[PDB]
Amino acid sequence: FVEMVDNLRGKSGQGYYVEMTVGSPPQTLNILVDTGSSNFAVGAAPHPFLHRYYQRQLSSTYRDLRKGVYVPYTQGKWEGELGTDLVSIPHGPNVTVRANIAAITESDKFFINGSNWEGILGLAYAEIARPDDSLEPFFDSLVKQTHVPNLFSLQLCGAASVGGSMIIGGIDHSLYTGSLWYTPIRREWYYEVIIVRVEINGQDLKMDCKEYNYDKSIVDSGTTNLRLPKKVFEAAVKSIKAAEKFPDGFWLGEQLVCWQANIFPVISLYLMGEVTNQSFRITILPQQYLRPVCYKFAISQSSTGTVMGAVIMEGFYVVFDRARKRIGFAVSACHVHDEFRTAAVEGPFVTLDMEDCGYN
Numbered sequence: 001f002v003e004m005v006d007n008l009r010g011k012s013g014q015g016y017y018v019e020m021t022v023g024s025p026p027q028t029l030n031i032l033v034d035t036g037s038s039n040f041a042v043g044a045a046p047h048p049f050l051h052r053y054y055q056r057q058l059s060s061t062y063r064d065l066r067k068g069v070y071v072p073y074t075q076g077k078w079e080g081e082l083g084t085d086l087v088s089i090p091h092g093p094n095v096t097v098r099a100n101i102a103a104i105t106e107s108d109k110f111f112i113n114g115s116n117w118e119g120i121l122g123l124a125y126a127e128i129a130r131p132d133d134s135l136e137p138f139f140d141s142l143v144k145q146t147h148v149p150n151l152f153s154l155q156l157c158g159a160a161s162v163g164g165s166m167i168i169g170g171i172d173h174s175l176y177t178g179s180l181w182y183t184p185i186r187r188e189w190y191y192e193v194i195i196v197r198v199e200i201n202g203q204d205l206k207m208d209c210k211e212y213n214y215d216k217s218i219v220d221s222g223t224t225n226l227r228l229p230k231k232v233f234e235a236a237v238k239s240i241k242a243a244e245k246f247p248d249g250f251w252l253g254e255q256l257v258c259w260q261a262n263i264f265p266v267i268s269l270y271l272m273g274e275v276t277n278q279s280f281r282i283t284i285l286p287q288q289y290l291r292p293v294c295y296k297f298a299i300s301q302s303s304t305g306t307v308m309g310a311v312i313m314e315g316f317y318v319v320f321d322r323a324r325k326r327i328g329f330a331v332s333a334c335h336v337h338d339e340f341r342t343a344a345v346e347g348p349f350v351t352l353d354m355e356d357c358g359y360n
């Protein structure tokens with residue numbers, strides 16, 4: 001799939017985007033790749049931060065759905081008008097599908113000033129689509145209208161500019177080393193998974209595993225940080241500082257920390273495996289959670305559950321195997337390492353009562 005290799009670009013902190021075309025004749029747009037939502041939504045009016053925007057009036061294949069959507073978040077919000085149109089991915093499979101598109105007509109704290117993308121491709125499931133689950137997500141339309149196999153994979157490489165690969169409909173073995181290990185998608189809404197154990201520096205947190213997934217744990221290409229429930233976060237900071245100059249605000253991501261150009265440990269998440277009582281672990285390095293910015297501590301707290309963002313994903317090739325309701329992780333070919341260590345994916349381990357780790 002050398003076709004699709006290196007089809008992702010971006011800037012540090014501003015997400016990964018893929019080029020797409022919309023409409024007839026095709027309009028080129030850069031589109032944020034987001035496994036944490038399910039709407040395909042594109043700027044459709046000259047907001048001054050945008051390099052480009054969807055112009056429905058130019059498209060002979062546009063169809064108005066005559067319904068608007070209001071989409072607020074914790075930070076920003078956007079509003080738009082729903083329609084369908086023909087959509088392609090030039091450095092993707094060789095097909096053209098009719099898909100839902102939200103023409104964004106008004107937004108606040110959503111688009112990034114200085115960024116080079118103009119829309120968002122929500123790759124998760126219909127259940128969290130707005131305004132509701134009848135609004136078929138793009139990838140569902142893609143698979144339903146073509147012979148493209150029902151899976152995609154992401155290699156996020158993070159270098160100011162970043163690159164990566166989104167292999168649509170398959171897997172490229174050049175993008176990873178060692179073996180793929182799979183964890184069950186617990187429910188098709190977000191890409192939800194279950195953390196059964198957490199280690200730092202090899203020693204374990206010894207918390208009720210339910211604390212790792214309150215009230216969910218997801219895989220999200222649209223988040224930068226590893227985001228942990230507060231309880232989990234504090235223990236992780238304790239263990240990590242243990243492995244100095246520790247201003248409290250820094251851990252709270254309230255301030256920045258500057259060193260000059262090992263006292264930080266590896267971090268292992270054990271994920272629910274495919275077989276009863278079997279799990280595996282993925283291990284990241286400080287090079288994943290210390291983000292060159294004066295590095296920012298890229299582990300943060302949340303109230304939405306655990307989120308495995310780019311801090312987790314830049315260490316791994318991640319396979320979103322929707323056909324088999326599962327997500328695979330393998331050591332990424334592009335991840336940043338030493339001559340001493342690497343990120344790791346290892347198994348099998350024996351972990352009992354894994355179902356109990358899921359909040360409900």
Ligand SMILES: CN1C(=O)C[C@@](C)(CCc2ccccc2)N=C1N
Pocket residue numbers: 014015034035036037073074110111112120220221222223
């Ligand atoms: C974490 N997350 C959101 O808060 C909602 C969205 C839709 C925001 C995507 C976004 C927007 C601007 C910059 C980065 C990511 N997707 C997410 N995955």
